Design a protein around this ligand. Structure first.
Ligand SMILES: NC(=O)c1ccc[n+]([C@@H]2O[C@H](COP(=O)([O-])OP(=O)(O)OC[C@H]3O[C@@H](n4cnc5c(N)ncnc54)[C@H](O)[C@@H]3O)[C@@H](O)[C@H]2O)c1
Ligand SMILES: NC(=O)c1ccc[n+]([C@@H]2O[C@H](COP(=O)([O-])OP(=O)(O)OC[C@H]3O[C@@H](n4cnc5c(N)ncnc54)[C@H](O)[C@@H]3O)[C@@H](O)[C@H]2O)c1
Ligand SMILES: NC(=O)c1ccc[n+]([C@@H]2O[C@H](COP(=O)([O-])OP(=O)(O)OC[C@H]3O[C@@H](n4cnc5c(N)ncnc54)[C@H](O)[C@@H]3O)[C@@H](O)[C@H]2O)c1
Ligand SMILES: NC(=O)c1ccc[n+]([C@@H]2O[C@H](COP(=O)([O-])OP(=O)(O)OC[C@H]3O[C@@H](n4cnc5c(N)ncnc54)[C@H](O)[C@@H]3O)[C@@H](O)[C@H]2O)c1
Lengths: 270, 270, 270, 270
């Protein structure tokens, strides 16, 4: 019952979860369900896709076709698709929640630029948990980070291709900044053979790849005699679907500006 | 080389660690080393006790004997001993770092009262780690605490007699307050047989007792799809010795008032 | 391409997973797909249900209807349903893989009795992982169990109603037997207030209930100076679907007898 | 009250623990306490060193001086020292428990050779826990190792110089053998940048270095839907002192042969 949303990528891993997350969320209605033209346009929506009910909400291929059908557009697709939707939403004040990744500089640039006519939440990671952990780790670095050893460990399924995750990296920068240094001057990503002694001031990263682990991140601050650990474990991708939808909702009343989860979660004044 | 400290309880589990912690700390000198009269007054100090060097600093039995020998008094003994030292330090402006526990109301009351003539740091738990975790858990409860399930797990050695630790309890109150409720209205300490379903809004506590674990505390905030955990592991009692000494030092320049670790660590503005 | 299986409960939480697990497994074909008569008999199978392909394999309501369609019958339904299927399979030598739980003594009794005419794998827990852990914990108890403190911790989602899980309980008995004692003479399930000291020889159990955790079990053997932990984490119910299907397959060539996972996994000679 | 032992290295990190472990153990008496000639020959033993009692047992510098004073010799010193003691014990049938590491091939060779005249327990790691875990991990690999991803994670204090520990390496070989392959053909020790996908069949190792962690080892076997983890956490070096002393005792009645913990712990028939 409020704000309607459109879900681009409706049959992809993220669009389904996004449908379930949307229904399930209150204060949000499911306006449109896009997919691209050429697929089996997998039975005009419903629980069709999102294994849910049925919903007279049926998947489509046309942006202008639905224009009056949603208020906020949520995208977890591909940079190229995004940029198109971006142009349309921008044309007709339609807010975006964007979680597609891998833009090039030009990519990102359109986004900030579309951001003065529409309201956009753009974020790398939409898990609330993760966004809080990043805030915590700062504080934490404030008082313990200094004199404590700092090591980040992250585990992911056997098909993740980049080591150490992007979240581990953000964790790393979050801290290094806190200590007001540069991640690049103090990071160590590998430890094989005779290393000699751990170097004070660095931030080691350890990386585990196995099974279907969706994502676990732990930050450690070790002194002599005690350890503080802050771990975030994602159990399923619903974790981002939930936080995308929460932000769609938060966009309510919002005319324009570029935002992220700190904005949504008000981690700022926190 | 600065501020000298006296260490009451010099041959007890805490007084040794406290000697090592003191030497090792910089900006602090070891002025006096008390024990009570009647013991083997275990070879007038040194590495004697604290397995350290030797130090022309030799253990004693007389408060007035050392009065000019230390500036700050650190006590991890017994309420009764404390109250005495308390009276002496109070007489002659001598600051206290107090970590003795188990006062009765009258106990605590003398303390606050001695607190207008001398400067005292009185704390239940002097581990920095723990004190930060407690600050974090609040913040955390702020944004996730609400709609997330909250469970505290703590492990301790097989001779701890009270379940769930005092730290778990403080963890619990730290949160419940954050959510602005009462720990007493929402706590669950045991789960045996047919419980039926977990009740939204409660804070379960699980308690593990085994071996020589000095102390591990984990707070969990579980949603559907993700978990944030904040764990503090004490590896040795040096963790409190360190933070007692850090507070002794912090007391420098301090005339009077009652304080604790939030004060020492400035967790306040944090 | 081999052995066909029928999946009773085809639209329940377990029957879908069981369909996916079956296709995906090799050396196994999907013969029949039952549901009971009266439901929306959720579109005669396929990826219909198990979000899979389509499969000319369509859900049904009639046991005799499919009799020539499967070789082994897999049941994760209700005791009452089971007992029926049981009678049919027993009539016409059809092997069972049974994972339905909660029989009464009479229940279990039919099962052992059907077991001399057909081959049945009956198990409480069909996760391979868990079945290995239970074997390990014995061995383990053999050499460390004795003089080490033993504590079992288990976490499950907020709608589990019985504390401490059935797996924790089996873990407990697995050990107690190893030490050749009785679980009932040495178990402790709760620890609230002044407990006094941990009692040598007992097996404490700690129980965590939160979010959507599907199931985590940890067994601890703590001495002075070291801890051995054996943890099994279920990430999704596919873990049992997989092991049910593996047993269906194992049943190949098997005329009759009652078996379980130790049999399937040959944990016996292990 | 039985078997006396001599402890070479009596003031080193290991010799003290070894004294405490010895007294504390029953069925073992403390015969001699060596150190080398030139040190402060730290007050002829007692709780002197091992912070224990006093013991008319006083530290020495002469092997022949004590020859009638102990039955079994325990060494955690240096290869060079070892080789000497080795020659003496060999001369006069005196059993050895050896935990000194870093021999060269010639080193090891003397040992096996001294092993036909005296009885020696020679082991890299004397923690019982670790020795059981290694046995478990085999079994485990037997049934799950194959099709599961295998990752070893180990943490150690900030002054350990070799990555991945020797225990992680032994863990690795223990498994690889189980699967009957070669550790060297399937190990991966580092994961930095674009790795591409995890390769089936390898054994990744992740390495954490921080604070004063004495040693934590975890072996993981991950499938789709479940994980089995076997973790061993050393809390203090007493863990090896205990197992050295247990082996000294086990040596009782033993004339000659080369042995290790599997022998002591009978992990063989296990
Ligand atoms: N930021 C976050 O927290 C977060 C989390 C998870 C994934 N993601 C991102 O979300 C996106 C979705 O990934 P996914 O796992 O759903 O995988 P996927 O392959 O299932 O997603 C592809 C989806 O996008 C649609 N799409 C592709 N190209 C398109 C085009 N040109 N025009 C229109 N529709 C197009 C596809 O039709 C499909 O629906 C990715 O960019 C991923 O990087 C982000
Ligand atoms: N607050 C913290 O973070 C923290 C942490 C650990 C322990 N503690 C507390 O510190 C204290 C020390 O415990 P401990 O493990 O050292 O055990 P312990 O038995 O070793 O401590 C006893 C010490 O106090 C001395 N003492 C006892 N009674 C005395 C008296 N009447 N007058 C003078 N000296 C006296 C004893 O002589 C001995 O030195 C306890 O109160 C404990 O509750 C606090
Ligand atoms: N042993 C294991 O490792 C294991 C693991 C998980 C669950 N289980 C068990 O498997 C079963 C399935 O649970 P579920 O989560 O799929 O939940 P569910 O509610 O989805 O399962 C019910 C399914 O059984 C069918 N069914 C019910 N009554 C029937 C009847 N009289 N005749 C025929 N069909 C009938 C329903 O139609 C439905 O398909 C339960 O008994 C559960 O205890 C066992
Ligand atoms: N195998 C195990 O499980 C295990 C565990 C821990 C350490 N270790 C080994 O045990 C040994 C002890 O290490 P440590 O931490 O006690 O450190 P350390 O520096 O305290 O040990 C040195 C000790 O050996 C003595 N020593 C040195 N050279 C000697 C010589 N030539 N002749 C006689 N005495 C001599 C020193 O006097 C001192 O007592 C090392 O080899 C270490 O690698 C083994």
């Amino acid at each position: 019952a409020n704000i309607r949303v459109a879900i681009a990528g409706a049959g992809g891993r993220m669009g389904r979860q996004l449908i379930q997350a949307a229904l399930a969320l209150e204060g949000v209605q499911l306006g449109a369900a896009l997919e691209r033209e050429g697929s089996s346009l997998l039975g005009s929506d419903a629980g069709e896709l999102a294994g849910a009910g049925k919903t007279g909400v049926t998947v489509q291929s046309s942006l202008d076709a639905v224009k009056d059908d949603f208020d906020v557009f949520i995208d977890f697709t591909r940079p190229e698709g995004t940029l198109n939707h971006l142009a349309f939403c921008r044309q007709h004040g339609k807010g975006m929640v964007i979680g597609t990744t891998g833009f090039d500089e030009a990519g990102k640039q359109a986004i900030r630029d579309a951001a003065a006519d529409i309201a956009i939440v753009f974020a790398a990671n939409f898990s609330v948990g993760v966004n809080v952990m990043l805030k915590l780790l700062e504080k934490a670095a404030k008082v313990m980070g200094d004199y404590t050893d700092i090591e980040i460990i992250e585990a992911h399924h056997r098909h993740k291709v980049d080591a150490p995750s992007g979240t581990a990296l953000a964790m790393g920068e979050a801290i290094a900044h806190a200590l007001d240094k540069d991640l690049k001057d103090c990071a160590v990503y590998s430890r094989e053979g005779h290393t000699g002694e751990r170097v004070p001031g660095t931030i080691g990263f350890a990386t585990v790849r196995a099974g279907d682990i969706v994502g676990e991140h732990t930050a450690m601050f070790a002194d002599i005699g005690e350890r503080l650990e802050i771990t975030h474990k994602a159990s399923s991708r619903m974790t981002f679907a939930n936080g995308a939808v929460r932000s769609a909702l938060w966009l309510s009343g919002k005319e324009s500006g570029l935002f992220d989860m700190r904005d949504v979660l008000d981690l700022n004044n926190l």
